[PDB]
Amino acid sequence: GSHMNPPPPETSNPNKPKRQTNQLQYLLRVVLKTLWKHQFAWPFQQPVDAVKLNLPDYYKIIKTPMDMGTIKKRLENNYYWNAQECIQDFNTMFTNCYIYNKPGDDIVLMAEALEKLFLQKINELPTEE
Numbered sequence: 001g002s003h004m005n006p007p008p009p010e011t012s013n014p015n016k017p018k019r020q021t022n023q024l025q026y027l028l029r030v031v032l033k034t035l036w037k038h039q040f041a042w043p044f045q046q047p048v049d050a051v052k053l054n055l056p057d058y059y060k061i062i063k064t065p066m067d068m069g070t071i072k073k074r075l076e077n078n079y080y081w082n083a084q085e086c087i088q089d090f091n092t093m094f095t096n097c098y099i100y101n102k103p104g105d106d107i108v109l110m111a112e113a114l115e116k117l118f119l120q121k122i123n124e125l126p127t128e129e
């Protein structure tokens with residue numbers, strides 16, 4: 001990709017301790033699966049390419065970028081220790097959208113639809129065993 005986009009968030013690091021939990025399995029098999037296939041997922045399936053979108057200020061404003069493509073890699077490549085780390089990544093993705101964009105912009109309506117599904121699924125996050 002372009003030198004004018006930042007490196008994507010970390011998805012590989014052997015020094016970071018890893019664990020499978022039943023909650024992380026739910027986040028991959030239920031939460032990410034549900035959001036990824038949504039009609040409104042596509043803007044969120046990869047990092048924001050600020051060059052291609054002609055948003056040169058995007059990474060001046062958004063200093064903690066996150067997207068579902070990164071989360072999918074982190075879940076599939078066992079990057080997390082716990083569910084809270086992954087829930088935080090989803091919440092960062094939504095708040096980036098809401099901070100950068102005007103309320104009622106199409107992408108905001110798209111993010112809000114995904115966030116409503118997300119909340120319903122996370123309220124049913126299973127008890128950790």
Ligand SMILES: Nc1cc(I)ccn1
Pocket residue numbers: 042043044047048049053107
């Ligand atoms: N190509 C695109 C377009 C949007 I809006 C968001 C992400 N990627």
Ligand SMILES: Nc1cc(I)ccn1
Pocket residue numbers: 004005050051054055056057
């Ligand atoms: N100078 C710039 C930077 C970006 I990122 C996109 C367009 N023009």
